[model samples]
Target: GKLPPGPRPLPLLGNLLQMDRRGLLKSFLRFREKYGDVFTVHLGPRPVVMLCGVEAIREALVDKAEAFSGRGKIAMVDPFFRGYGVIFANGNRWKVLRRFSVTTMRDFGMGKRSVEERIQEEAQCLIEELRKSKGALMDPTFLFQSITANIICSIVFGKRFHYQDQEFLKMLNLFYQTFSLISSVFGQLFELFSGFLKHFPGAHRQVYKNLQEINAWIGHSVEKHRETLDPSAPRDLIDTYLLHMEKEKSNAHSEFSHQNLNLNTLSLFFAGTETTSTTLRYGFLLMLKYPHVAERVYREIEQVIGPHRPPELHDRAKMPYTEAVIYEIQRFSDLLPMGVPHIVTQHTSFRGYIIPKDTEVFLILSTALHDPHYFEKPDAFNPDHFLDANGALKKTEAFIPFSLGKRICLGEGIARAELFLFFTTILQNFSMASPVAPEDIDLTPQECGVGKIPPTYQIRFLPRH
Candidate 1:
């Protein structure tokens, strides 16, 4: 089996030296120059194929999801996830969890009012907190984490917490560290060489420890829910899963295990939190970088939501600019700079390249979003990317921030509503002003693993008339 096209690899290190902790995306982008799109790179001995451009990504992610949507089949996550959660599971298990999450999220207001209210409530709280700061500079990462994490808490556990609550603080810290490690190059290397990396010092150790802690937290919560077993009064994901498990006990078809319930819920909690908040954090810088664009979006909010009341789901259509800005925020910021990988389930041919079964393939999401063919001015921040001639928001098939195809982000609908509701709601109340000069707000993404969040920066939340 001939490998895909890529640069020369070192004897044993492979392309590991090509990747840096802070400058991973830059390296990958540089690789794209030589490899074209569908190329293979080595992390030590393992051969991983990178699928750049919209077509190759679509083939890898959409056309071949069942065959390629197996990210945890690799080392570290396989051991950590144990072939359970949505990210790790395949065939029946992945399908069930995906269907359950999509349906349950819809039931809980995924594209509707139920989800928006939670974000709105949190955004309101953020406004109140920001008001207390009285235009003083605040990082807002902590506050934003509270909102993002709480939405998952609400969705999974049907609860919320005070920002300073020790439990919440602990979970937030775990997320901060875990997300940082996950996006780091070590995370990528760990996936390829989990056993070898664990023996070495790095994120491998910390991530393993954090996973245990997070898993334990989920177990304790699940046990509590099991004891409360209100057969009729299922509150959150744990209760919901437990209820189904009880009813489906006689059936052999359902994929419900106590361990799975914990893993799935924890995955949702981990996946849901911080990703959106980090985008919003960058949204501040992007909007500040393009203040005229921000002003136009603000006017749309005023026109649709009016100044006296908070923006709601019903106003989403009327505020096209605001919605588009949120979309552009994800597009321009392109948080997940590198690809989240999947493994081929069967032999498949893509763009003249024959991928053998079980090969590791990457769907470079950042490349797809910024491909000049789909997005005009790939590098610029422009809300018009999502707007039509009449300025109504139009969904672009290529505009995939939560990713696309079968393995797209599970909380995509819920996240979209939250971004639109929370971002615009906050904008409707307070102007998203920066403390430093607009040029000083770093737009260059800092990468570690999966996340490419903005540099930790403070912004001044000024009162809007």
Candidate 2:
């Protein structure tokens, strides 16, 4: 099949030397400028068609949603995911899991009042934790991880652990390590050379090990839920899934299994935890970098939420600047910029190229985020990008931090809510002033992965009262 114009590949190496292994975003942007938006690049033996900017990505993922929605394989994730879970599953199983997960999340209060209370409750818990800091300088990486993880735990596990719980710490740490490794130079190299790279040493080994350990943790929790299963009154996601598995036991082709339960919940756990926490971490550091922006958000919080009460999701409507700041954070941070890979479901003609079925494709989201076509200053962190002239939250389709189309992120609503609540709640209670001068603070990301892992920075959360 004829492919879009790109640099010719040489033997098995397949343009590997032409691309920067770790500086992946820069590499893709450079390619976009050299080649047109839709061009092919061979990473080793695999020929992936890259989709640059929103128009190209949307044309395929949105306009041709059916053909391009097929889940693409990740060499680093495939062994552990095994095409079983929502993140990796394809065909009917993928559709089934997607439907169930979306509905189940709703039933479990994802967009409802109950989940708001859960988030507000957690925010208070976080507020109390910060209060204990007594305005002292603290690195909140672990604290943010615990808070976000616990919020997901409350939904999936039916309970939240103490902040100092050892087992919970291990599980969260394992996820952290896996995310870090996947974004490391070794991880990128492993993907490029995965055809033969598995035999050699790299971060890929550690990723596999972490997934194994994480699966064990999920399996152990599922077992506990099984032993205490209540068919009439489900406790959480595990209980609800066990009920489904029981009801579907007679179907010989059922997708439900103990293994799948772990995979499904583990996907939620990893997705729910790292992305939100990393963004929260990035948001705080940016606030440090630009104190004025932080102060504006804080003023919005004070005007809307006040000192006596906690920030609610609905309060977002009254605080446009706060909402804009949160949006700007996602846009600027651009977590998961290299988006999970996708495949064409059938042989398809697109943008003058005939892409064969099951071909790996990258709708590089970073290009859209930094595209000058939509954003005024694509590289700078400015909330004004999302703000209208009259100070209302502006609207633009170009700001797609979650990618686009039918297969867009599952937790978009929940994640947006969480970001607002967490961002405002923290700022409302404490001033996140950095120890270093505002000019000295750095906003550059470190160890980029599926999630934008920011360098750890310290700030004092001085109590407002």
Candidate 3:
């Protein structure tokens, strides 16, 4: 049995040079053009398969979901964290935790009116925070991260943080720093040589230190929830998990142990904060780069929502241009261009190749999101990609920012709502301006590591009134 073709690997370094030279996502794109959709490349000593385009990804991740359902383990965390969280867990552990998370999130008002009210309230607070700047050039990084993380804090811990809360600010700063280190070059090197890098002095050490601080904070919250547990009334995720743990106490093989609870809580906090906030940050950068598009978005908001009116979910329908702009932002931003890797749990024949069990898989999402076959001027930012002739919102199969199949982002509903609600409310209340001329602003991401890092820039917000 033979595997698919890819760039020939050397004995030890195995395609690492090619990836480093061309960038990870671009290397896969080049390989896909030459070797076709399902191809195998070696990460180090291990052979990893790359799945490109919609058809191949759907076939593997959707059609044969079970065989490819396993989450690829991250080498960077193996030395310390292990596979304790929902994101990296596989088999029965993953199934149980995932189901519980989905149900608990729903119960805690993830897609319900409760969550909507929370987001709306937070959006107002964010508006006021921006207003305090008084039209000064603001970075908007911490403001966006703080605001977004507060929503997660509310969901996970049943409370929100104030902007000036020193403890909460430190946690947010730790998250930002940890994310930067994880995406840095040393971070990639650490993954390749975790065993070797663990003892050596490098920036990789900071990643674990940050996680310790984050986990310590989470543990404090968990202990607080432990002391105040009432089965009759669950406050948030921590409370609900505690209740479940008690119920499953007799089942020695249960996955709802304290270790999992902590890890899963950390997972939710990490995921809930980083992705959406980064997308919004990147979206704002695009707006600064393309003032004409921002002007158009403001016009639509004024016509449909007005400056004084708060933008709601229903307003999204009346404002196609705004909706289109948001979609384009997600598409154009290309966050997680090469999505979280997957693994083959069992030996499976996919497409024309025989893939061995435990082989890592990469779903190159950018191929689909930026596929020229589906998106016109795919490289450029164009809201019209998501708009029909009548200026109504249109759907394209290639538009998959949340990814696809059984492992699609768990917070898709909340994320979509946040993107729309936060985006519309912000634009509705203010017009965005940059310190430099609009044309001088470059929309290209400053770096591409685990995610796209937008270039650091400042903006001045002019009140619509």
Candidate 4:
């Protein structure tokens, strides 16, 4: 039972000191060089294995599949979600929820005409809102958040809210705040000490209160759905899951239940909302940084879509530069740098290392995105990385921002459609300009918590003729 090599841990602090010195991404980079691709680092008292390069990640998540399919324990999320939802559930429950989500999302037009239409309509609304700003400097964080969340709202609740609606704004704010806190130092500490921190008065305490509010909101939505649920005509995920819950009530081992319905729907809402909006925010910032890149994408939009016609999913293929920019946006931003942690499901043998059951594993997808071997100038913001000699869109296997394998992002197709449509649609009609000089514009993420969050910055939008 030989564990991979790592810097020795102190009595209680573990490698937190080293990680703090160089930051998480750089820390892993250093460790991978010193300890090879697979190694272990202690987070508090736990010795978590780190999977560095693409090959190791693939071997564990894809090649080994079932052996590494188990959901790792997340201290920060466990208190609120328990073991109920797709993000944290394992074995039969996870399989059931994952299958249901994939099927239901497809039915709701996930990758098809129905959902694309929803996004097109929303893109129009977004453009209208940006136009109203009249070139004034504005942080479009919530603007993007509202637009993205509404898509999920339409699918989950069978409704979308006006951007200014107080209730909708409140929920969006809660989600934004929760996302920030969970990736903060306080969030990390709470994860390591959930039991001790639960009773204390601190920033971590606020996370609990926030979860309670979000839970109550979801609970209310569920009750409303139940009252008007149509057995014959299910409107959205809530209706579909409630029906499943009823049908599965007779089966004692069933995963469907009232609690799971709320949690799972909440999981979908969170997944569908924050990360996409964050990526768009980063893309917007990058456009501010690289105006030439933005102009190229705009030209493609004009040549392909024209100003009069709204952008659609099919139009993505016709606009290689725009598509490449979007892919480069995700790559450059590197959201979820460490990825949601994973654990070995059973005692598993991985590349000569024996990983005991339930041992925590971190598949560092960020390393893959920045691997020098796969991507030329892996660190820079270059759409050329995804373009061939003919300048057509080139697909690279290493461009895995949504991650890969069995737990690949469920909303990946929907998210991709939204990014292409929303980004290209906006760029087609307007040019983005930062208030500061182009060199003055900063594209660094404000925080590197659970995910990388683009700094809050304002850009002026000039209507393109």
Identify the leading candidate in terms of lDDT: 2
lDDT of every predicted structure (CA atoms): 0.77, 0.85, 0.84, 0.85
Per-residue accuracy of model 1 over 218-309 as CA lDDT, tens digit each: 78877787788787777877777887788788877679876678888878887788788888878877877888887888888777778868
> What is the alpha-carbon lDDT for the whole of candidate 2?
0.85
- Candidate 3 contains a number of clashing pairs equal to 0
Q: In angstroms, how far off is 436's CA in candidate 1?
A: 1.4
Pairs in clash, predicted candidate 3: none
Weakest lDDT window of 10 consecutive positions for candidate 2: 20-29
lDDT of 2 at 393: 91
Residue range 1-465, candidate 3, lDDT tens digits: 778888888977778777745356666777787888888888777888988888788888888987888888666554445788788788889899899989998888899988888889999999998888888888888878887888878888999999989998888888777777776667666655566667878877777788888999999989999888888999998999998888889999989998898889988998898888889998898888888998999898889877787888888778889889999999999888878889888989987689989889888888888888888899998999999898889988888878788788998899888999999888888888887887788876666666777878888888876
lDDT of 2 by residue, 1-465 (tens): 598888778899987778865566666667778997998888788888999888899999989987999988778878789998898999999888888888888878889998888888988988898888898887888888888898789889999877778988888889888898888767776667887988888777889899999998888888899999989999988888889999999998888877678898999999989889988988999998898998888877777778768788879889999889998899899888889989999999997789999899989888888888789889999999989889999978888888888679998888888898888888887887777998998787778655568887888888886
Candidate 3, residue 222: lDDT = 94
lDDT by residue (tens digit), candidate 4, 279-318: 9999988998889999888788878888889988889778
- Residue 187 lDDT, candidate 3, scale 0-100: 66
Give lDDT: candidate 1, residue 123: 79
lDDT for residue 255 in candidate 4, whole number 0-100: 90
